[PDB]
Amino acid sequence: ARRFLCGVVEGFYGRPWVMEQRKELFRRLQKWELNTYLYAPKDDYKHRMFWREMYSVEEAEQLMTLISAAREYEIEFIYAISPGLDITFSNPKEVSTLKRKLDQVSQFGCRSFALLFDDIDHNMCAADKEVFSSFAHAQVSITNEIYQYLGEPETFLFCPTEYCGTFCYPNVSQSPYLRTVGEKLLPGIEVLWTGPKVVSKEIPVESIEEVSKIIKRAPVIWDNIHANDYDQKRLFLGPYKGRSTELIPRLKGVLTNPNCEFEANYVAIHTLATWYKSNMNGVRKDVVMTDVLYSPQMALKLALTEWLQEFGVPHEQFVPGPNEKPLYTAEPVTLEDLQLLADLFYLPYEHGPKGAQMLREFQWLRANSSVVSVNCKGKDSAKIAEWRSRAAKFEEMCGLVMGMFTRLSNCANRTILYDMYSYVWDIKSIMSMVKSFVQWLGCRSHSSAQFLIGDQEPWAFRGGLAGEFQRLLPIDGANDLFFQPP
Amino acid sequence: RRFLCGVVEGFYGRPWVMEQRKELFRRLQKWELNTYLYAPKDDYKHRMFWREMYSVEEAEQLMTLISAAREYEIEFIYAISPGLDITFSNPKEVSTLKRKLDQVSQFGCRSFALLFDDIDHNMCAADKEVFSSFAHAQVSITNEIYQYLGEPETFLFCPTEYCGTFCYPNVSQSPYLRTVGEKLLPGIEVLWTGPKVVSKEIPVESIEEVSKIIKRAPVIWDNIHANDYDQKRLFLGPYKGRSTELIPRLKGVLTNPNCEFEANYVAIHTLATWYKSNMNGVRKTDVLYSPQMALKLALTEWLQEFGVPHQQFVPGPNEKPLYTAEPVTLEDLQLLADLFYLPYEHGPKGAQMLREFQWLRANSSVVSVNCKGKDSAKIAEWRSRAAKFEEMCGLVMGMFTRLSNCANRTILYDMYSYVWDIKSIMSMVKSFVQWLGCRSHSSAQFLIGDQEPWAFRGGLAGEFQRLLPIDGANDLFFQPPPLTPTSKVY
């Protein structure tokens, strides 16, 4: 019986989700007892780049249908807006534009709102510097004014420029900016925080205790963990991890900002749910000495067993004799399938256990390929027995990557595979070649040729040029490599 | 004089939609091409489950597509692939093949193809008791269907050995291809992808040789600009590799493009330029077609597709200036295509962009420590080149920024993954050059945020890629240790 915003924020750069997805997202948030959606796609011209522009007629059609579906499924809908690059804070025509706009969205029927000054510039126009002491004074000034103008609504969020640890000048505890915000932002307005980093691997309890104290209020975490709009493109099907259930009593909310690809955000949200549900009634426990619950590996196993249900089933008749060619058949996705997929495409900072192992083993076999190579007669009869045994469980395990792909690709409704096809087709491709290499390594004693695959050696082109460049950036070590014979 | 030029939709992966298939027809006609071949590998009723009749919702849509093709003056060819689980000897099986082609013939299809590509040579026992060979079976049934349909104008056969590499023991004396030649009814045309799957170039004798054993001229299935096989590259380069010479040695050309629908602009436009270049010729490096030229005519036309760049308040002269989106330009599209050129060679711009970066890297030594024998031709060579480089790393970021501030983002979003990764590494590369060039203002490690994200080799598949065998050259570069230790003990 305490208010807590927990859900999803669509806040990434890239081609935004469309309606029948958002409509699904709401079904899902509801089913798993979460309660909030933040609308803040970086690619909606009208949300940020071109904020002054009022929504179109066709646009108002779409926007209102959303807000109803949201209200239908018991999900608090928040409209967000980012004037920053463009805006001139002091000139009051500017402020009027902003109020008009949010009144249009108010009209479409949204009740809760949000301003963000995220990823903008530190510097004001001279015009504004003549009115305002600080950059922060500026933001707070008009944030407050809008807050009141819309009649001090229950839910209202402000995302500061300094939105995580590594972004406060000079440090969290004495940032003149975060002070001003803390002091002068109105008390009903909540603050968004992405943790100690932008994409924060862990969110220490003492982190939150610090930033809480300077902004005079327990923040709402915008959590960029499973987000994938930053570097090279990767996919994160791993669980919610790195935040203690202890955080929950010290927070007004957690809103996960995940993978651009929509269908990849099942586990990302499902586990966030389990995490919240686990300790939503806990009391502040004094864990930083200053005055059975939740397992990522379990929450994952639940989510994947449940995910299975959305992959759905795979695809007089003809019946071939016992010497006729046997009918193509489609098998279902297994659980073990998803469990491998999640481990291959896990979290930004580590792989999952099934994936970690395939590497360790490949890496062993590579570093021991010499033990079978004519060489010192036998040198050892049981060092060999091991490498051969150990090679053939690796051959077999590659096997299950190839199967994982086929069962996903035959399962009759391909909307989930298709939404992440590139990602899955890359790993399965490369494993095909890695299996073929380990085989070649078993046979290189009575040949001295080179490892080739239909004469092409194609793993060299992966990424094309994008990749050629990245492969020149600095590496620690060249103990590995395995050069090739001419 | 009747010659099949156009597009085959023949790729592994998610098929093109009705709405895109109509626009392909508009563009084919605009550019005066004539043919379309329906062979999407993912349509369950095309290959895997070929013996299921189309439902009414599906029948409805394929009638509409066929009508479309009629409206835009395009030959529509319905292919079918029964090679995975067919039992050749059994007649219920040939019945079914017939009934399925009859279903499609009533949707108003005039022309047809049978495909036996990307399968193994291994027949079942019942069949080995009846046909002399895999060819013999493939041929018996194809002839029988072709006839059953009243020997249509246009009927295609894709062989299992559909290129040089795939032949055994080799093109000239394959027993598979010998039999196709001898026994495949003369009326039927045969597909062929060149000497490889993705043929870098298609020499004229290569065609003379295959032409001889199949005893006809082939229609080329061209995988040059396809990415079905490797979904980490995109191919915005020009048709090239194939002499205008072989236009009279062929019966047609059907390109198999990128899976992404909107990357196939240059790839078709330049193909059409090439066909026109010599529609009417006789028998007996390439004087009528220049890729460099045909590429530029294509980029110039593609640009009007990208549309216009989005956009009563005025800022004071001391107030905060307005946002301003900028137009995409032609040096933008020229750089894009040059970064995403062809399967076997980069664009000259991209190719330079790299050569420069690898030089700067190799002569880092000179700017690492102090100054000694560091001339014009030592240091202030580097300093110069390094800033000429830095500026063009800049230009990449431009073309992304401007592509993503179009009013109509369709063309971008269809290639987002590819164009994003290129700009994100260029960014990451520029910062390296900077650090190289002032390793004496301190002596850090090279870092971003405060770790190194390029090291995640874009995924787990990435960390496996690096452990496969390596050139032995394009020499490495190493990150120095943290320098700052934490123990008394050595």
Author numbering:
A (entry chain B): 57 to 347, 372 to 395, 536 to 706
B (entry chain A): 58 to 341, 370 to 396, 537 to 715
Quote what the paper states about this structure.
The regulation of O-GlcNAc cycling on thousands of nuclear and cytoplasmic proteins is coordinated by two enzymes. O-GlcNAc transferase (OGT) catalyses the addition of GlcNAc, derived from UDP-GlcNAc, to serine and threonine residues, and O-GlcNAcase (OGA; CAZY database family GH84) cleaves O-GlcNAc. Composed of two ordered domains, the N-terminal glycoside hydrolase domain forms a (β/α)8 barrel, while the C-terminal stalk domain is composed of six α-helices. α17, consisting of Glu676–Pro694, undergoes a dimer ‘swap’, playing a structural role that contributes to dimerization. Structural characterization of the human O-GlcNAcase orthologue (HsOGA-L/HsOGA) showed dimer formation both in solution and in the crystal where it has been shown to be promoted by helix-exchange in contrast to the non-helix-exchanged bacterial dimers.
Surface-entropy reduction (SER) is a concept in which flexible, solvent-exposed residues, primarily lysine and glutamate, are mutated to alanine to reduce the entropic loss during the packing of the protein into a crystalline lattice. Following the co-expression strategy of Roth et al. using pACYC-Duet-1 Gly11–Gln396 and pET-YSBLIC3C Lys535–Tyr715 plasmids, the successful pair of mutations was Glu602Ala/Glu605Ala (HsOGAE602AE605A). Therefore, crystallization conditions were re-screened using the HsOGAE602AE605A variant; crystals were obtained in 17% polyethylene glycol 3350, 0.2 M sodium citrate pH 8.0. The space group was P3121, which is a lower symmetry group compared with P43212 for the HsOGA11–396+535–715 structure. However, the structure was determined to a resolution of 3.3 Å, which was a lower resolution compared with the HsOGA11–396+535–715 and catalytically inactive mutant structures, possibly owing to the thin-rod crystal morphology compared with the large trigonal bi­pyramid wild-type crystals. Unlike HsOGA11–396+535–715, the C-terminus of monomer A can be traced into the active site of the symmetry-related monomer A, with Lys713 binding in the position of O-GlcNAc. Hence, the C-terminus binds to the active site of the symmetry-related monomer A rather than monomer B (as in the wild type). The C-terminus of monomer B could not be built in from Pro707, indicating that it does not bind into an active site because of the crystal packing.
